[PDB]
Amino acid sequence: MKVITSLISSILLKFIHKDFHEIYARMSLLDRFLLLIVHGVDKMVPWHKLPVFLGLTYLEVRRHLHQQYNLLNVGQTPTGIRFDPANYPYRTADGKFNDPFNEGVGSQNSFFGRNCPPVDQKSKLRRPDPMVVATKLLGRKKFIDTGKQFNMIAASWIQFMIHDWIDHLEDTHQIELVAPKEVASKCPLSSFRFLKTKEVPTGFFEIKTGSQNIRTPWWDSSVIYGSNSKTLDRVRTYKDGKLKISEETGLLLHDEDGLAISGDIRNSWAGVSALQALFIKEHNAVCDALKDEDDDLEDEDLYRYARLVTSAVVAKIHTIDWTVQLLKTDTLLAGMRANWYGLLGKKFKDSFGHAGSSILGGVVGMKKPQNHGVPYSLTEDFTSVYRMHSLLPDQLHILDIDDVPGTNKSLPLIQEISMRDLIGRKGEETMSHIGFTKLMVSMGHQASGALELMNYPMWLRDIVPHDPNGQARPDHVDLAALEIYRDRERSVPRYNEFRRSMFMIPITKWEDLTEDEEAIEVLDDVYDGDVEELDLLVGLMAEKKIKGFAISETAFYIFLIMATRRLEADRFFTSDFNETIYTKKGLEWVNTTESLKDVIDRHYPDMTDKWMNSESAFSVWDSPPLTKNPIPLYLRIPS
Ligand code: HEM
Ligand SMILES: CCCCCCCCCO[C@@H]1O[C@H](CO)[C@@H](O)[C@H](O)[C@H]1O
Ligand SMILES: [Ca+2]
Ligand SMILES: [Ca+2]
Ligand SMILES: [Ca+2]
Ligand SMILES: [Ca+2]
Ligand SMILES: [Ca+2]
Ligand SMILES: [Cl-]
Ligand SMILES: [Cl-]
Ligand SMILES: [Cl-]
């Protein structure tokens, strides 16, 4: 029967796109049927046009297929000797001892995994020229924003997450890119130097080398706690479990060089510093709540509990508040909330407990972590799809918070500040003058840039990059050109091959990608008509967006699997998401915090009442009021 059904699965191969016939051979019988269904929907009414309940059904199936076929291990698993996870009921300084079966999984300096098989591009690192790509396709011509959907707090937030998640170890070898004559007059830098990505031998045939992640890939708030014991030590006060902050201003402290003191400040700016400070306040407020409950808790005990609570609050806010604004559709409102609370919902879970399955109860609080047989990591492909620098504006619009708010709590502009004055060391100085409140309100009221072509801040095409400790390097970089180089250097498939690897129908011509006729002509020029040479970053920016999505669908499918993975693979969101590990009050703190607004309201009790008219703190704050849709969420049809 299995052999006969296999023969029928080879018969139905006549309905699958030819480019998937290879991944199809890897697949189980049921999964072959599931691919037939997913692919069928892709060819008919796309998932994002279905009624929410069917959209979610599609995403559940597609996500399952990515979990089975788009998780590739890189390097030997850092198993180590056997350990008891009960001996590590807290987030370790370097992320070790989380995976109960592999001590090194998710730790600092672990290998980046992959979602798509690598494509060696060493012979075409400069084809087409990355500075030509940057100049013609990326550099911002006219600023394009995201309307009211996704403000500068939301742009700060995603960078704040990147600083927790991913950074590539560099080698000592220097590379130099030179601007060709054709574009040199339009390049801020005529040439620039940077460090090669460290390419470490794995010892395997399939994937022979890998990159190492110098941030813990666990979602452990290493952005404020550091990624090892040495960097943790720098942020600890050693009093009452707390972290360093200015009590007077609510801003970060600075060292003798004027560099901010937090977990990871590499290539940072004022918006990130604001979020670091806010979450240090959160951590410290958890310490206060726990020290009161129990006066027998020492500094180390308080720190450990407060870190569990704070990192869980951040993950929750990201999942059910931030992502819901990035992906502003009914289907993703339902889907992201279901990741946390399950299809059955918050009220049910809060009343009756976890239903037992991830679908019904959420991945959060599941009985065991799940890695789908592949050790947890954040991947090369994940890095590429989160390259979202076009979110940044040219200037920050500082508002007059002394003025009486107008209709929808609007405020007038008082000054425009170049983003150059808000980044790195200079940004800390500028922020000291502006202050937390003025910066936060101004960011709330300002739209981000959109992820479209020709919208990459020109100021990023000549920036001073940092060593991992935030110290300035003498060699400036053109970040737009550099990102193109990195994706190639790290063997991430270019746009069309990436799509095929993720069982998405590849494009055959530029018109499949975008309706913008002038952009099509630039694409055709840069790539000499060849859709197979189209860079991943370029394609991700160019791709026509689903209504309400700030990102491409191609990026979204990586988000779909990896966001779920960050929660489900981690003991502290699953087997150890309970009152014993978090304390009763600690777990309550997580379970009653639903949004960034809740956190802002905790530390700045009047800010959102005075100045925020939107429901989410990640939406532009002077948005008009919205009347709720009376149609039940799971039944809504997109228009
Ligand atoms: C003022 C703000 C920012 C500055 C100065 C900055 C600068 C940089 C620099 C210099 C690099 C390393 C380039 C290299 O050597 O490979 C980098 C990497 C990166 N940035 Fe930004 N960036 C900023 C904001 C953002 C934002 C808003 C995002 C949105 C998600 C973002 C996402 C990333 C990602 C995913 C990487 C790759 C990390 C890796 O290779 O592991 N950055 N950035
Ligand atoms: C795992 C796949 C998840 C569900 C896929 C179901 C798609 C079929 C839906 O067709 C039904 O009839 C219509 C014709 O008018 C469709 O357009 C409409 O949306 C839908 O109500
Ligand atoms: Ca981390
Ligand atoms: Ca000290
Ligand atoms: Ca006690
Ligand atoms: Ca306004
Ligand atoms: Ca033209
Ligand atoms: Cl270090
Ligand atoms: Cl995400
Ligand atoms: Cl919760």
From Swiss-Prot:
Inducers of expression: Induced by salicylic acid (SA) and by some chemicals generating reactive oxygen species (ROS, e.g. nitric oxide (NO), intracellular superoxide and singlet oxygen) such as sodium nitropruside (SNP), paraquat and rose bengal (RB). Accumulates locally, at the infection site, in response to both incompatible and compatible bacterial pathogens (e.g. Pseudomonas syringae pv. tomato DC3000) in a SA-dependent manner, with a faster response during hypersensitive reactions.
Effect of residue 318 to A: Reduces oxygenase activity 14-fold
Enzyme Commission no: 1.13.11.92
UniProt-recorded name of the protein: Alpha-dioxygenase 1
Annotated site (Transition state stabilizer): 266
Outcome recorded upon mutating residue 386 to F: Abolishes oxygenase activity
Residues the record lists as binding heme b: 168, 389, 486, 490
Encoding gene, per UniProt annotation: DOX1
Effect of residue 565 to A: Slightly reduces oxygenase activity
